[PDB]
Design a protein around this ligand. Structure first.
Ligand SMILES: O=C(Nc1ccc([C@@H](O)CO)cc1)c1cc2cc(Cl)ccc2[nH]1
Ligand SMILES: O=C(Nc1ccc([C@@H](O)CO)cc1)c1cc2cc(Cl)ccc2[nH]1
Ligand SMILES: *Cc1c(COP(=O)(O)O)cnc(C)c1O
Ligand SMILES: *Cc1c(COP(=O)(O)O)cnc(C)c1O
Ligand SMILES: OC[C@H]1O[C@H](O)[C@H](O)[C@@H](O)[C@@H]1O
Ligand SMILES: OC[C@H]1O[C@H](O)[C@H](O)[C@@H](O)[C@@H]1O
Lengths: 798, 791
């Protein structure tokens, strides 16, 4: 019924909004016109949803994050509004390729990976469960960089996703706010005043987050920096306005790594000031002793801290409460802890934020004083409980007195939050009992666990219509808003017809994605090959290297015995490297050197193909994932706090090869360990090896197939023009590898062999896939948000 | 009919486009919703007009300019579409204040004054006459600065007119183009190649220019710079450099500032534009017809690089022989001169151009050498002629006389007023006019009667139409019909009433902004335009003080009250202009707070003078100050604005003032002071300012008062700089016109006491305004330079 109206609406927009006609209209014009057509169906419910929150005043959730890895919005919006099939019909009748139009949209890559993607999935889940949630972030003019491979190496290009404009955002001018920087503190008899500061304006841009088929559309408020107006040399002054606006210019491209750069600190405070102000504003403009207001603040507001990035929010709330609202420290401190909650995402020391006191002193002087306060009161408590353990004092202080006095933002988060959480059982256990044992001892109840999740809308209905259709056609639609209902799929473990249909879906995905790989890359894809893929950011801990040592091992075997039955494979590895990460870039170069050697060897032919999937990102993850057979999740045990990509492959029909790390463990729990290809060392095994001391050359000497791979890389087999090109990798691998690459090699290759074995038996392979898919339920972000809402936010879904 | 549809359309937009409802909607939302509602009526005719140009292929006009002083678009659009009364009715019924909404719109102040305003008026006129014209400029993220007065001095604030977005513009992404900078030249056997350059992208933003009631809507294409797609962070941040090319408009009026970034802008707009033009031409042996399909008007010497740029494309990229290219180039370009002041003439240092545009310096040398070779073959002995005509000023720092580049690469050169074009032709460029007499022309400036009458003065326009018809809008010449009422006393009361309603409506503006209390029966004496020593706001300032002194001296003599209003911005780097602004505000403070003067004399420095504000004050003035030194104002357009709006003019025989005297009758304008020759005869004898200081009593007091501290007790010698310039370095003869000026001003006050005769002179002036319509100006451009037919 809306087909004819959608068509008229589309024409209305191409004309009035794009000022074009079917003859001089670009593909982009059609994209824009469709986006506007679809976007219009959001306004009604968006105005309504927000109006409902004002009248019913339910407790609000504020997901404060420096990242929001959103991807494209069009298709995602069409599906959550039950409009995709109608729009597809509309665009078809107009003679246009709906798929061709969706590809015009630029990804909103305002994230690095995992962390920023958890925020996006959470927004979609909170809207679906009907919660009064808001996401607050920074509207980076440039998100994570577009990645190119030139001469084998990664090259970074600016991701100006806003060049042609973003129809999915609406500037909210009336809500602009000032943010302060530098200045000095002046204590007076009127309270404390922070003066002589530089002001920067925050202009919020709202984006709607449609819940899946439930009339609600929430808000994602992203802030952008702007120079204020008040107050030769004139030109430069106008140009210098770029400095203030530089605060929200680029997203820092570091995954699990702390770079103590001033501009980054400015961003963290930036989003924190604007957000808290806006939140205090909404609270006061709502229906909810001289000071009879803020007492109810904790029962109306819940601010979730995504990692330690917005940690400044705690002392910032104390600054407003004490300096501006004039509350006693006691009361403010009380309300602060009842308001904030912290989520930890890593145990890697290089990923922990420790800002130098010097930097914070000249940038946020009033906040350094507040952190000292919090700390002193914090240590006074510790002393009154353990007056002799002096070592306990420095281990719990928010200030690392060592060499360069820094602020342990993590510790700041634990005291200013009533709840701290990990993102996976094993991870939260380590966060609770190991990393912050001194804190958990004192506040056992504080530390919790909330296993991560992914939204089945974007990661099933959207990216895999075929698989979704298959499922709904056997157990209903219910599984969408209750992924747990996927267990019903166990009734078909014997049905051979269902297994052929399962395989067919995966097949259509592989063929549709192979064409993507042939119009982009040189190589020719073996459609019957097994799709072995590893896609995620490039880290030594995620160990794309281990996988790389495997491809070379497979290569060597084929050349050695060029007639032995080899189960063909299309090994796909992808992910971006942080510009300043040298080993990660060397690793990317390695991978592309091998590929070039494997794909052009006539003796190997269709047996083994290697592809470095370029510019891995959200919209691209939606193409490759539904098309994979084997998922690589091989990080060293204890390095991955959880992982979500592992969850994405599981719901989409891929088997998993990986260690007992992060969420992999819980995946084994749900599907049955035997139903996953688990291998290598586990927690304790890594511990026992660090005690004894790691000596890599012994595995090099005790493992034949390994020695050749390593010799080949080091002698120049994969880089004749530069014989010692990978010397750095070899040196790290032999005397500085803290991720035990060689230590898992044998268990890995042995595991991989089992994988190929099973692949030759489609009946059994697909049987394991069903068991995996049927056990994916737990890993839905809806389940995750329910636990957050019930055990941390104290809010009710819907 | 459309009131009900406009209302539904308005709601449609507030909801779908602003995501608001009548309860949480801001005034700004209502403005945006209305703009969108009105903007929608433009799409059909805009698509159509452009489509028509493609099919009928009429010769196109390209107004290439660094400035476009556009003002607000809403109301202007409503009027040219015959939609204002219907929209006003729509907004009224919805319970909103239409006027309140229009005030939300930010002016598109991408201009300095006069020059940039002539471009805007021209766009409106070309669209009205139905010509296939396009305006090409730079979309400055920041136009001319908003001006504030703090502690009496001018303070500059950034004019971020794009903060909340501009609904009147549409990015045309598919037409982005690359612009080159720096690099080096490498001559090879394949032609000439300009390599190793830095690239900057030009992203065009189109804005529709609705013709007045004629179905056509033209295009104004404005370009913005973009970078092409923690050493990484800094590199991403450094993208600001490339984008800095279109960041700000240089705020200099009649002044050359040889800054590199400015040169980058000039080339920037020139490269993108020419490329887009070559593109459109090819998308319609080829280039032979180029001059008959394209006409590129150079607004001043700012886009002069366009000439060698066209030669670069033709020769380096299109591979045409130098001869043919050079031929087509001259047939394509036309240059308009706007000033004779040496400090306003562009002379770029060769060194700068060599490292920025090396290929273009070679092209300019080429043009020059061939140019001098011709001069020699005609006058093989006059060596002095050679350096006087060369495009390179060999002197000290070798510079490029862009003006001379414009004369040889253009088939037509024009001034903007008879007297001015005569000086440009016979004096400034006599050596060029001698060789190519036919080349130099005159095109007296004009102003659009849509924006400067129907828009800013609905009352006066209504009055006129109600007596002679609507015709005067598309043929201002028809205003002469107003002569039939010179005797009608009822028409004179009605004329005065209109002016009165304007003054009262504007006085309220002056009271909600400034401290002072306005005398509604006073005479509104105003001077509004950029601050220059040549425009002489100073002379006016010496007059206010003279009036002040007289009142205190004889606090009972019959003094014709006046509200002297002076306004305009000063270029940040112009010291004398800023001193002058300070002076004016010091006097005002001394005149407005003197109880002995009271309602007799008020002085106001009108802050942040700009287009939308000119639309308020002009319709409200009685006396217009146009007192520049004879020969300094090439033309002026503000003088034309006041004339059409009911103000009398006091001024010298300069620029367009002369032609105004011609049309209305000299006796009908308060002309005074020296004329061309008189200024010449005084420069021959040599100017000695102290003699007028000694020979003129009332003058000595004013000057003594300023220099001793009467207008600055806390800083007794604050204006020493003004005094020194006024006494030993004044090249604009301020003191030399003082006596003739004050004497003239007295006559003005005399006539003001006789409303019957004052209003009789106003009618004669308004009735003679016809010539000064930009429609008339464009017709002459179209017929004698562009060879295009108005519709
Ligand atoms: O940007 C929007 N409107 C707009 C309005 C006016 C203008 C300009 O006229 C400048 O304000 C530009 C964009 C917009 C509407 C909207 C609706 C939904 Cl559901 C989601 C995102 C949205 N963005
Ligand atoms: O900005 C416009 N459209 C637009 C198109 C797309 C988007 C977004 O989809 C981002 O590209 C925003 C605004 C626009 C339409 C229009 C019509 C006339 Cl008549 C005059 C000026 C105009 N500007
Ligand atoms: C899901 C996803 C991630 C996170 O997955 P990991 O394997 O844990 O790193 C990162 N980036 C993108 C683009 C994703 O879609
Ligand atoms: C008309 C106008 C001018 C022109 O002033 P002149 O003194 O004639 O050069 C300048 N600025 C604005 C805003 C105008 O409307
Ligand atoms: O918490 C979400 C994700 O954040 C980061 O990506 C962590 O490295 C990953 O282990 C975790 O799953
Ligand atoms: O040509 C438009 C205007 O250009 C310059 O501003 C001149 O100073 C002025 O006299 C002229 O009216």
């Amino acid at each position: 019924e809306n087909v004819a109206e959608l068509k008229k609406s589309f024409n209305r927009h191409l004309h009035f909004t794009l000022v074009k006609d079917r003859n001089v209209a670009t593909t982009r014009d059609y994209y824009f016109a469709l986006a506007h057509t679809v976007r219009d169906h959001l306004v009604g419910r968006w105005i309504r949803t927000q109006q409902h929150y004002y009248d019913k005043c339910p407790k609000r959730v504020y997901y404060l994050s420096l990242e929001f890895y959103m991807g494209r919005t069009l298709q995602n919006t069409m599906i959550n509004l039950g409009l995709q099939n109608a729009c597809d019909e509309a665009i078809y009748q107009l003679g246009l390729d709906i798929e061709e139009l969706e590809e015009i949209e630029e990804d909103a890559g305002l994230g690095n990976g995992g962390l920023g993607r958890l925020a996006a999935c959470f927004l979609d889940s909170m809207a679906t469960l009907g919660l009064a949630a808001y996401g607050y972030g920074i509207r980076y003019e440039y998100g994570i960089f577009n990645q190119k491979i030139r001469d084998g190496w990664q090259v970074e290009e600016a991701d100006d996703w806003l060049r042609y404009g973003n129809p999915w955002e609406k500037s909210r001018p009336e809500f602009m706010l000032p943010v302060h920087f530098y200045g000095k503190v002046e204590h007076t008899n009127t309270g404390t005043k922070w003066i002589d500061t530089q002001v920067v304006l925050a202009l919020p841009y709202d984006t709607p987050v449609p819940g899946y088929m439930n009339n609600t559309v929430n808000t994602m408020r992203l802030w952008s920096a702007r120079a204020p107006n008040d107050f030769g040399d004139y030109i430069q002054a106008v140009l210098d306005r770029n400095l203030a606006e530089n605060i929200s210019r680029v997203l820092y491209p570091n995954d699990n790594f702390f770079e103590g750069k001033e501009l980054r600190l400015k961003q963290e405070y930036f989003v924190v000031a604007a957000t808290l102000q806006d939140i205090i504003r909404r609270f006061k403009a709502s229906k909810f002793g001289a000071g009879t207001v803020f007492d109810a603040f904790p029962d109306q507001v819940a601010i979730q801290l995504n990692d330690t990035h917005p940690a400044l929010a705690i002392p910032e709330l104390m600054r407003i409460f004490v300096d501006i609202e004039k509350l006693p420290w006691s009361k403010a401190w009380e309300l602060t802890q009842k308001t904030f909650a912290y989520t930890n995402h890593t145990v890697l020391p290089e990923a922990l934020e420790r800002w130098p006191v010097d930097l914070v002193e000249k940038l946020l002087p009033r906040h350094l004083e507040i952190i000292y306060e919090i700390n002193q009161k914090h240590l006074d408590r510790i002393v009154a409980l353990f007056p002799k353990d002096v070592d306990r004092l420095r281990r719990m202080s928010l200030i690392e007195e060592e060499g360069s006095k820094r602020i342990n933002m993590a510790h700041l988060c634990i005291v200013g939050s009533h709840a701290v959480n990990g993102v996976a059982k094993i991870h939260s256990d380590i966060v609770k009992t190991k990393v912050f044992k001194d804190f958990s001892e004192l506040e056992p109840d504080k530390f919790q666990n909330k296993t991560n999740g992914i939204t089945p809308r974007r990661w099933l209905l959207l990216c895999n219509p075929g698989l979704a259709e298959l499922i709904a056609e056997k157990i209903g639609e219910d599984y969408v808003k209750d992924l747990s209902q996927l267990t019903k799929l166990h009734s078909f473990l014997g049905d051979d017809v269902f297994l052929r249909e399962l395989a067919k879906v995966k097949q259509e995905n592989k063929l549709k994605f192979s064409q993507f790989l042939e119009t982009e890359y040189k190589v020719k894809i073996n459609p019957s090959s097994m799709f072995d893929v590893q896609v995620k950011r490039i880290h030594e801990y995620k160990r794309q290297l281990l996988n790389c040592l495997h491809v070379i091992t497979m290569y060597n075997r084929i050349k050695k015995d060029p007639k032995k039955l080899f189960v063909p494979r299309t090994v796909i590895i992808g992910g971006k490297a942080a510009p300043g990460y040298h080993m990660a870039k060397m690793i990317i170069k390695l991978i592309t050197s091998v590929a070039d050697v494997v794909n052009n060897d006539p003796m190997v032919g269709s047996k083994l193909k290697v592809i470095f999937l370029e510019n891995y990102r959200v919209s691209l993850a939606e193409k490759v994932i539904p098309a994979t057979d084997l998922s690589e999740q091989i990080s060293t045990a204890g390095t991955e706090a959880s992982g979500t990509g592992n969850m994405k492959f599981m719901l989409n029909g891929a088997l998993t090869i990986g260690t007992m790390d992060g969420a992999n463990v819980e995946m084994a729990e749900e599907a049955g360990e035997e139903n996953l290809f688990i291998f290598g060392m586990r927690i304790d095994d890594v511990a026992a090896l660090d005690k004894k001391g790691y000596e890599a050359k012994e595995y090099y000497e005790a493992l034949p197939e390994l020695k050749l791979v390593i010799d080949q890389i080091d002698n120049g087999f994969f880089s004749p023009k530069q014989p010692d090109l990978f010397k750095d990798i070899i040196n790290m691998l032999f005397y500085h590898d803290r991720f035990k690459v060689f230590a898992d090699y044998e268990a890995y290759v042995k595991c991989q062999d089992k994988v190929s074995q099973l692949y030759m038996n489609p009946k059994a392979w697909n049987t394991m896939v069903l068991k995996n898919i049927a056990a994916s339920g737990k890993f839905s972000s809806d389940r995750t948000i329910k636990e957050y809402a019930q055990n941390i936010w104290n809010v009710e879904p819907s």
